[PDB]
């Protein structure tokens, strides 16, 4: 507890100097209710604030601080004023009432939300005005606008979200006078505090990139400090109960991707994550990470709960190119002749690879190569050497995911009319009518290609299409015809959810291999463009 005198005192002696004093010295001199005095160094003084230490517990309402009488002979008082002439201070005509000063913890859940966590409780149900209870500062001293009004979340928690984006070095304090927080405990007001940083909970997201090793995305530039790893994350297992025992952690230069290396293996949807309560080897500058807001770890976000050869996926966008994914985006450098990373099974060579990736998702498809059209085959990743980076250019090279096949998908698609529509393919194919495996042809003209082939764009519906007749060995192609309304540009094409859904009366499947249905292009769907008619 701190007292503030109004003015200047002094601590005195049996002989000359003053510095501090213990239990028993101190005792005489003031009377806390219902406490206890620390064992030692209890009296410290300096400037006009007087500091009291305690080893019982703050408790809200019946807490309260007294003087004593002091006999003018005694040998330990205290004076007024500054030296050794003062005159003895007096007693209270009623003790103080102490109040509650300091918060427990502030961390940043969304670069636009905080909360503040109280240790007293307080009623619950109001909407105060942010401005009037709470203040925040960035490192440079300037001071932030509140979006909106603060709410009273619980007993210990009010939240509320701010115009700019928060920033870990922030500080954050109150203003205490207001009504609004008022314990339950001795109906007390909450008073002023101190500065603390505001700690980064929240992440983007992880990434098992391996059997046992995984990213952890964060939206801050980290340093990471040489401490034991079980004692910094607290990684939970399939089941529940902690999983993070001889764990280890590493960070690249850049400082965002940090990498945990656990001792048991990842499977299936589950495995969660989280930093320990108390920890200070991983620190966005200021001293620590957090715990998350939310009382429960995160989650490796679903579709890359695991990493192997049940995730990665080749696909054929044209006769020489493939089109490999990957956990997240990688790095490599543009390989300028074949490419080692990967090795093709039955008989196809590569010349270069490079990386491409979706909007969203950058840098995250390797597009090898090659020196011919595309035998029916699959691909095995070694990255043995080791090339292929994770997340960035000092990451950790990916696992490997042997023998996975090559699939088919559309290459291309023109308008040679208003309702015409030329589809291209990329290797030889044939259509078979259904019952969806291999049953037997179709004739050259069906009338019910709309259960293959989807419009999204327009008023026009899918007709009829021309069988691909054993052709070029080249551009292999085929003709498709519109039903209500002239085709509007801006269409796209692509595989109608029939065709694994086991309900098209007719099926596309390519010669080489008759097992494999056609698929869906990573990189997005197919875009129908215009051409000449005659």
Same mark, same amino acid.
Do not use: H
């Given at each position: 507890?701190?007292?503030?005198?109004?003015?200047?005192?002094?601590?005195?002696?049996?002989?000359?100097?003053?510095?501090?004093?213990?239990k028993?010295?101190?005792?005489?001199?003031?009377?806390?209710?219902?406490?206890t005095?620390?064992?030692?160094?209890?009296?410290?003084?300096?400037?006009?604030?007087?500091?009291?230490?305690?080893?019982?517990?703050?408790?809200?309402?019946?807490?309260?601080? +007294?003087?004593?009488?002091?006999?003018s002979?005694?040998?330990?008082?205290?004076?007024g004023?500054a030296?050794?002439?003062?005159?003895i201070? #007096?007693?209270?005509?009623?003790?103080?009432?102490? !109040?509650?000063?300091?918060?427990?913890?502030?961390?940043?859940?969304?670069?636009?939300?905080?909360?503040?966590?109280?240790?007293?409780?307080?009623?619950?149900?109001?909407?105060?005005?942010?401005?009037?209870?709470?203040?925040?500062?960035?490192?440079?001293?300037?001071?932030?606008?509140?979006?909106?009004?603060?709410?009273?979340?619980?007993?210990?928690?009010?939240?509320?979200?701010?115009?700019?984006?928060?920033?870990?070095?922030?500080?954050?304090?109150?203003k205490?006078?207001?009504?609004?927080?008022?314990?339950?405990?001795?109906?007390?007001?909450?008073?002023?505090?101190?500065?603390?940083?505001? +700690?980064?909970?929240?992440?983007?997201?992880?990434?098992?990139?391996?059997?046992?090793?995984?990213v952890?995305?964060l939206?801050?530039?980290?340093? !990471?400090?040489?401490?034991?790893?079980?004692?910094?994350v607290?990684v939970?297992?399939?089941?529940?109960?902690?999983?993070?025992?001889?764990?280890?952690?590493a960070?690249?230069?850049?400082?965002?991707?940090?990498?945990?290396?656990?001792?048991?293996?990842?499977?299936?949807?589950?495995? /969660?994550?989280?930093? /320990?309560?108390?920890?200070?080897?991983?620190?966005?500058g200021?001293?620590?990470?957090?715990?998350?807001?939310?009382?429960?770890?995160?989650?490796?976000?679903?579709?890359?709960?695991?990493?192997?050869?049940?995730i990665? %996926?080749?696909?054929?966008?044209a006769?020489?190119?493939?089109?490999?994914?990957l956990?997240?985006?990688?790095?490599?450098?543009?390989?300028?002749?074949?490419?080692?990373?990967?090795?093709?099974?039955?008989?196809?060579? #590569?010349?270069?690879?490079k !990386?491409?990736? %979706?909007?969203?998702?950058?840098?995250?498809?390797? +597009?090898?190569?090659?020196?011919?059209?595309?035998v029916?085959?699959?691909?095995?990743?070694?990255?043995?050497?080791?090339?292929?980076?994770?997340?960035?250019?000092?990451?950790?090279?990916?696992?490997?995911?042997?023998?996975?096949?090559?699939?088919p998908?559309?290459?291309?698609?023109?308008?040679?009319?208003?309702?015409?529509?030329?589809?291209?393919?990329?290797?030889?194919?044939?259509?078979?009518?259904?019952?969806?495996?291999?049953?037997?042809?179709?004739?050259?003209?069906?009338?019910?290609?709309?259960?293959?082939?989807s419009?999204?764009?327009?008023?026009?519906?899918?007709?009829?299409?021309?069988?691909?007749?054993?052709?070029?060995?080249?551009?292999?192609?085929?003709?498709?015809?519109?039903? %209500?309304?002239?085709?509007?540009?801006?269409?796209?094409l692509?595989?109608?959810?029939? +065709?694994?859904?086991?309900?098209?009366?007719?099926?596309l499947?390519?010669?080489?291999?008759?097992?494999?249905?056609? %698929?869906?292009?990573?990189?997005?769907?197919?875009?129908?463009?215009?051409?000449?008619?005659?």
């Amino acid at each position: 507890i701190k007292v503030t005198l109004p003015v200047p005192i002094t601590l005195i002696k049996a002989g000359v100097s003053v510095a501090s004093l213990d239990k028993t010295d101190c005792d005489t001199l003031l009377t806390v209710a219902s406490g206890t005095l620390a064992a030692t160094g209890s009296c410290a003084l300096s400037g006009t604030v007087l500091t009291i230490t305690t080893t019982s517990t703050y408790t809200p309402g019946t807490t309260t601080v +007294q003087f004593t009488a002091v006999a003018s002979s005694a040998s330990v008082k205290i004076l007024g004023g500054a030296g050794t002439t003062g005159t003895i201070i #007096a007693a209270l005509s009623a003790a103080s009432s102490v !109040l509650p000063g300091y918060l427990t913890s502030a961390v940043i859940s969304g670069a636009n939300t905080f909360t503040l966590t109280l240790p007293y409780a307080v009623t619950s149900g109001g909407n105060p005005t942010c401005s009037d209870i709470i203040e925040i500062k960035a490192a440079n001293g300037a001071m932030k606008t509140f979006n909106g009004v603060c709410s009273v979340a619980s007993a210990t928690t009010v939240t509320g979200t701010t115009n700019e984006a928060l920033l870990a070095s922030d500080t954050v304090t109150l203003k205490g006078a207001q009504n609004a927080l008022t314990t339950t405990t001795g109906s007390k007001i909450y008073a002023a505090t101190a500065a603390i940083n505001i +700690q980064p909970a929240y992440l983007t997201g992880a990434y098992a990139i391996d059997d046992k090793k995984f990213v952890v995305v964060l939206p801050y530039a980290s340093t !990471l400090a040489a401490g034991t790893c079980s004692s910094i994350v607290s990684v939970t297992d399939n089941n529940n109960g902690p999983a993070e025992s001889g764990c280890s952690l590493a960070l690249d230069g850049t400082g965002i991707y940090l990498t945990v290396t656990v001792s048991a293996s990842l499977t299936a949807t589950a495995w /969660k994550v989280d930093f /320990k309560a108390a920890q200070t080897a991983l620190t966005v500058g200021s001293t620590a990470w957090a715990p998350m807001a939310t009382g429960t770890a995160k989650s490796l976000n679903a579709g890359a709960t695991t990493w192997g050869s049940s995730i990665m %996926t080749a696909t054929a966008v044209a006769t020489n190119v493939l089109e490999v994914t990957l956990p997240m985006s990688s790095y490599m450098a543009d390989i300028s002749s074949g490419c080692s990373p990967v090795t093709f099974s039955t008989a196809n060579t #590569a010349a270069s690879c490079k !990386l491409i990736g %979706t909007t969203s998702s950058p840098n995250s498809i390797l +597009q090898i190569t090659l020196t011919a059209g595309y035998v029916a085959g699959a691909v095995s990743l070694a990255n043995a050497a080791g090339l292929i980076k994770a997340g960035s250019a000092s990451g950790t090279a990916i696992g490997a995911a042997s023998t996975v096949t090559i699939k088919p998908t559309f290459v291309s698609a023109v308008a040679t009319g208003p309702r015409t529509i030329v589809v291209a393919l990329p290797i030889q194919s044939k259509i078979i009518k259904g019952a969806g495996d291999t049953c037997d042809d179709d004739i050259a003209s069906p009338a019910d290609c709309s259960t293959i082939f989807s419009l999204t764009g327009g008023t026009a519906t899918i007709a009829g299409c021309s069988n691909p007749g054993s052709d070029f060995t080249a551009p292999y192609t085929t003709t498709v015809t519109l039903a %209500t309304a002239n085709w509007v540009p801006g269409t796209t094409l692509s595989v109608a959810a029939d +065709q694994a859904a086991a309900a098209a009366t007719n099926y596309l499947k390519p010669t080489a291999a008759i097992t494999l249905l056609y %698929t869906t292009k990573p990189s997005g769907a197919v875009v129908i463009y215009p051409s000449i008619s005659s």
